[PDB]
Design a protein around this ligand. Structure first.
Ligand SMILES: CNc1ccc(C#C/C=C/c2nc3ccc(O)cc3s2)cn1
Ligand SMILES: CNc1ccc(C#C/C=C/c2nc3ccc(O)cc3s2)cn1
Ligand SMILES: CNc1ccc(C#C/C=C/c2nc3ccc(O)cc3s2)cn1
Ligand SMILES: CNc1ccc(C#C/C=C/c2nc3ccc(O)cc3s2)cn1
Ligand SMILES: CNc1ccc(C#C/C=C/c2nc3ccc(O)cc3s2)cn1
Ligand SMILES: CNc1ccc(C#C/C=C/c2nc3ccc(O)cc3s2)cn1
Ligand SMILES: CNc1ccc(C#C/C=C/c2nc3ccc(O)cc3s2)cn1
Ligand SMILES: CNc1ccc(C#C/C=C/c2nc3ccc(O)cc3s2)cn1
Ligand SMILES: CNc1ccc(C#C/C=C/c2nc3ccc(O)cc3s2)cn1
Ligand SMILES: CNc1ccc(C#C/C=C/c2nc3ccc(O)cc3s2)cn1
Ligand SMILES: CNc1ccc(C#C/C=C/c2nc3ccc(O)cc3s2)cn1
Ligand SMILES: CNc1ccc(C#C/C=C/c2nc3ccc(O)cc3s2)cn1
Ligand SMILES: CNc1ccc(C#C/C=C/c2nc3ccc(O)cc3s2)cn1
Ligand SMILES: CNc1ccc(C#C/C=C/c2nc3ccc(O)cc3s2)cn1
Ligand SMILES: CNc1ccc(C#C/C=C/c2nc3ccc(O)cc3s2)cn1
Ligand SMILES: CNc1ccc(C#C/C=C/c2nc3ccc(O)cc3s2)cn1
Ligand SMILES: CNc1ccc(C#C/C=C/c2nc3ccc(O)cc3s2)cn1
Ligand SMILES: CNc1ccc(C#C/C=C/c2nc3ccc(O)cc3s2)cn1
Ligand SMILES: CNc1ccc(C#C/C=C/c2nc3ccc(O)cc3s2)cn1
Ligand SMILES: CNc1ccc(C#C/C=C/c2nc3ccc(O)cc3s2)cn1
Lengths: 55, 55, 55, 55, 55, 55, 55, 55, 55, 55
């Protein structure tokens, strides 16, 4: 076989899960957050996949 | 087989799940948030997939 | 087989779920948010798939 | 088989769900939000798929 | 076989999970956060995959 | 002060919410159920406050 | 002060929430159920407060 | 002060929450269930407060 | 002070939370269940407070 | 002071939390369950407070 990509690719066979991202956010997984009190200014309480590039 | 992509591709066979994103947000997964009190200015309480690029 | 894409494609066979996004938001998954009090100015309380690019 | 796309495509066979988006928003999934009080100026309380590009 | 990529690629066969990211965040895994009180200004309470590049 | 009750009482001051029940059902709280398919014979799908005393 | 009860009482001061139950069910709290498919005969899918005393 | 109870009482001062139960079920707390597929005959999927006394 | 109870009592002062139960179930706490697939006959998947006295 | 109980009592002062139980189940605490697949016949997957007295 032959393949040429510029990116971003994701090429496969017999594949149970696939995610391609440029951005941005993708949530595909099981996630449970239980929480009782959030205070403070300002605290990232429960972050799973996170990116902060403030300018 | 032969394939040429510019991106972003996601090419496969026999594949249970697929996500392609440029952006942007995609939520495809099970997610449960239970929460009782959020305060503060300003706190990211429960973030799963998150991207902040303020300018 | 043969395939040429410019992107963004999502090409497959025998595939249970598919999402293609450029944007933008796509919500296809099970999601439960239970919440009791949100305060503060301004706090992202419960974000699942999120993108903030304010200029 | 043969396929040439400019994007955004989503090509498949035997496929239970499909979403193609350029925009924009698509909501196809089960979603339950229960909520008791939202305050503050201005806090994104419960966001599932979200994109904010204010200029 | 032959392959030439510019990156970022992810090329495979017989592959159970795949993630390609440029960004950005991708959450595909099981995650449980249980939490009782978050205070302080400002403390990253529970971060799993995290990136902070404030300027 | 003095108080004598036989029950069921609920005596208070400065009190935001009150429920007294003998029975019977009382629903006073925020509740959101989103649901896509219920089958089976016979399965309690989503029960919040529930009591079954069949004889 | 003086108090004599037979039960069930609930006596208080300065009290934000109160529930008295003999029965029976009382739902006063925030509750979110999101659900996609329930099958089987017969499975209690999502039960929060539950009591089964079949005879 | 003086108090004589037969039960079940709940006597207090300056008290934020109160529950008295004989039964029966009382749900006063924040609860989020997100769920994607329930099968089997018969499986208690997600039970929070639960009592089964079948005879 | 003086107190005589038969039970079940719960007597206090300056008390943030109170639960009295004979039964029966009481759910007053924050709870998040996220779940993707339940099978089998019959498996208690996610039980928090649970009592099974089948005869 | 003087106190005589038959049980079950719970007598206190200046007390943040109280639970009295005869039964039965009481859930007052923060709890997060995230789960991806449950199989088998029949396996207690995730049990927090649990009692099984089948006869
Ligand atoms: C009797 N039970 C009680 C009594 C008090 C409390 C409480 C509280 C939180 C207080 C906070 N103050 C600030 C001030 C500045 C800031 O940036 C963040 C915070 S959070 C809970 N239970
Ligand atoms: C002022 N600040 C900024 C911020 C971001 C940028 C940018 C950019 C370009 C992003 C691209 N992504 C892809 C993905 C796939 C593909 O095939 C081609 C491209 S080009 C410029 N200035
Ligand atoms: C008797 N039970 C009670 C009594 C009080 C409370 C409470 C509270 C929260 C107070 C806050 N103050 C500020 C001030 C500034 C700011 O930026 C954020 C916050 S949050 C809960 N239960
Ligand atoms: C002022 N700030 C900004 C911010 C963003 C940008 C930008 C951009 C371009 C994004 C593109 N995405 C794709 C995706 C697929 C494809 O085949 C071609 C392209 S080109 C410029 N200035
Ligand atoms: C007796 N039970 C009670 C009594 C009081 C309360 C409460 C409260 C919240 C107070 C807040 N103050 C500010 C001030 C500034 C700001 O930016 C945000 C906030 S939130 C709850 N239960
Ligand atoms: C709706 N408008 C707004 C306004 C502001 C925001 C925000 C934010 C996040 C601020 C953070 N600061 C710190 C400092 C130190 C550290 O280690 C981690 C962090 S995260 C979101 N939306
Ligand atoms: C109209 N219908 C269709 C049908 C098929 C297609 C397609 C395609 C792309 C196939 C590729 N295969 C490989 C293999 C290896 C590699 O490194 C890169 C690539 S890209 C589009 N439209
Ligand atoms: C002032 N700020 C901004 C912000 C965004 C932009 C932009 C843009 C272009 C987006 C494109 N998306 C696609 C997707 C598929 C495709 O085949 C071609 C294209 S071109 C410019 N200025
Ligand atoms: C001032 N700000 C902005 C904001 C957005 C834009 C833009 C744009 C173009 C979007 C396109 N989408 C598609 C999708 C499919 C396709 O085949 C061709 C195209 S071109 C410009 N200025
Ligand atoms: C009687 N039970 C109680 C009594 C008090 C409390 C409490 C508390 C938290 C206080 C905080 N103060 C600050 C001040 C500045 C800051 O940046 C962060 C924080 S968090 C809990 N239980
Ligand atoms: C055949 N099966 C059953 C089932 C239930 C019963 C029963 C009963 C009695 C329940 C009572 N509750 C209260 C509550 C308060 C009070 O002051 C007095 C009473 S007496 C009998 N047979
Ligand atoms: C109508 N209003 C009221 C007012 C008060 C009451 C009451 C009461 C019970 C108080 C007790 N104190 C103690 C102290 C020590 C000990 O070992 C056992 C006990 S029992 C009922 N109804
Ligand atoms: C055949 N099976 C069953 C099942 C249940 C029963 C029973 C019973 C009695 C329950 C009572 N609860 C209270 C609560 C408060 C109070 O002051 C007095 C009473 S008496 C009998 N047979
Ligand atoms: C192509 N996508 C598909 C195809 C099939 C299905 C499905 C299904 C469920 C089948 C069941 N059979 C039984 C039999 C007996 C019983 O007691 C309970 C059940 S539930 C979902 N998506
Ligand atoms: C609507 N009707 C019905 C009918 C049946 C049921 C039931 C049930 C539970 C059965 C269990 N068996 C086992 C065996 C072994 C073990 O370790 C744990 C458990 S839990 C509920 N509702
Ligand atoms: C056939 N099986 C069963 C099952 C249960 C029973 C029973 C019973 C009695 C329960 C009581 N609870 C309270 C609570 C408070 C109080 O002050 C007095 C009482 S008496 C009998 N037979
Ligand atoms: C192609 N995607 C697919 C294909 C098939 C399925 C499925 C399924 C479930 C099958 C079950 N069979 C039984 C039989 C007896 C019983 O008591 C319970 C169950 S549950 C999901 N996705
Ligand atoms: C056939 N199987 C069974 C099963 C259970 C029983 C039983 C019983 C009695 C339970 C009681 N609880 C309390 C709690 C407080 C109090 O002040 C008095 C009592 S008496 C009998 N037979
Ligand atoms: C291609 N993707 C697929 C294919 C198949 C499946 C599946 C499945 C579950 C099968 C079960 N069979 C039984 C039989 C008896 C019983 O008591 C419980 C169960 S659960 C998921 N994804
Ligand atoms: C291609 N991806 C796949 C393929 C297959 C599966 C699977 C599975 C589970 C099979 C089970 N069989 C039994 C039989 C009896 C019993 O009591 C419990 C169970 S659970 C997941 N992913």
């Amino acid at each position: 076989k032959k393949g040429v990509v510029h990116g971003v690719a994701t090429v496969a066979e017999k594949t149970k899960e696939q995610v391609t991202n440029v951005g941005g956010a993708v949530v595909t997984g099981v996630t449970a957050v239980a929480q009782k009190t959030v205070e403070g200014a300002g605290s990232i309480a429960a972050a799973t996949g996170f990116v902060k590039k403030d300018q």
